[PDB]
Design a protein around this ligand. Structure first.
Ligand code: HEC
Length: 104
């Protein structure tokens, strides 16, 4: 749907671990550092599991769609204790938000 819907639901279910949106930080997932077009294996010392970075899958709409719907299927060894959002429109709105969040 919208950018707004994505940042607001991110700040509810995601900033809870990935505190990118204010004071860029990483409590139990990395800061989403400029993701759309970039690689994994990039957090400043946030010591996550080997297999994510090692799989190298490149972050974009497709790969973050397959990932945030189905993470441990899409890339093995992901420790993301959440596995899915709720509404497929929050899923849209996250793509709409994170498409912007590396430029706006
Ligand atoms: C804390 C328990 C988390 C919650 C809630 C969410 N995420 Fe997560 N995420 C978590 C872990 C442990 C990791 C590290 C890497 C791994 O695969 O284990 C991640 C990773 C991501 C990524 C990819 C980062 C990268 O590899 O560069 C993204 C894009 C991501 N998570 C997004 C995200 C969103 C949008 C969330 C709200 C629905 C969310 N995560 C919740 C842990 C946690």
């Amino acid at each position: 749907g919208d950018v707004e819907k994505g940042k607001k639901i991110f700040v509810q279910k995601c900033a809870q671990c990935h505190t990118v949106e204010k004071g860029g930080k990483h409590k139990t997932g990395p800061n989403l550092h400029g993701l759309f077009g970039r690689k994994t294996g990039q957090a400043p010392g946030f010591t996550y599991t080997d297999a994510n970075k090692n799989k190298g899958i490149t972050w974009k709409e497709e790969t973050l769609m397959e990932y945030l719907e189905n993470p441990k299927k899409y890339i093995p060894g992901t420790k993301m204790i959440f596995a899915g959002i709720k509404k497929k429109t929050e899923r849209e709105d996250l793509i709409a938000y994170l498409k912007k969040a590396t430029n706006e």
